[PDB]
UniProtKB/Swiss-Prot annotation:
Keyword field contains Acetylation: no
Organism of provenance: Homo sapiens (Human)
Name of the protein this chain belongs to: Retinol-binding protein 1
Keywords annotated in UniProt: Cytoplasm, Lipid droplet, Methylation, Retinol-binding, Transport, Vitamin A
Expressed in which tissues: Detected in nearly all the tissues with higher expression in adult ovary, pancreas, pituitary gland and adrenal gland, and fetal liver.
Length: 139
């Protein structure tokens, strides 16, 4: 069992620029985005997940049901739309993002007080780790 509910602060962000490059993100935006240390506010409500990734540049909001395919609007990220499914893989969430790019997806899991997120596209891998925090941020 796992529960992702919480407020999470970025600790590390490894290889994000190459991940965004593989998504054809403009190098100016790659540099802006890799400077960001976003927070994540997550509510797991049964199998209804809300993952709010919050930064001073752009936010990215996910709101989906585990196991149910949906249309994911990535206009703010790489100007694409995918047909996405997030599924349980034991205590991990496994996301497949079907679309133009091959091998696009991610895996999210918890180890202790750490939220781990590995994002992948076209064989390129970015790894992020967040720490669970308790001082809440008004948004
Ligand atoms: C050109 C651009 C790059 C990156 C972003 C942000 C971004 N950083 O990552 C994501 C969404 N995906 C790529 C990764 C992800 C986040 N949560 N999950 C489960 C997967 N947007 C950084 C803070 C939020 C907006 C926004 C715009």
């Amino acid at each position: 069992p796992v529960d992702f509910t919480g407020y999470w602060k970025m600790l590390v962000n490894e290889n994000f620029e190459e991940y965004l490059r593989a998504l054809d993100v403009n190098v100016a935006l790659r540099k802006i985005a890799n400077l960001l240390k976003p927070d994540k506010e997550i509510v797991q409500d049964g199998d209804h997940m809300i993952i709010r990734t919050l930064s001073t540049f752009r936010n990215y909001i996910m709101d989906f049901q585990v196991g149910k395919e949906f249309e994911e609007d990535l206009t703010g990220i790489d100007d694409r739309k995918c047909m996405t499914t997030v599924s349980w893989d034991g205590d991990k969430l496994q996301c497949v993002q079907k679309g133009e790019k091959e091998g696009r997806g991610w895996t999210q899991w918890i180890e202790g007080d750490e939220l781990h997120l590995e994002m992948r596209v076209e064989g390129v891998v970015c790894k992020q780790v967040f720490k669970k925090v308790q001082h809440h941020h008004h948004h």
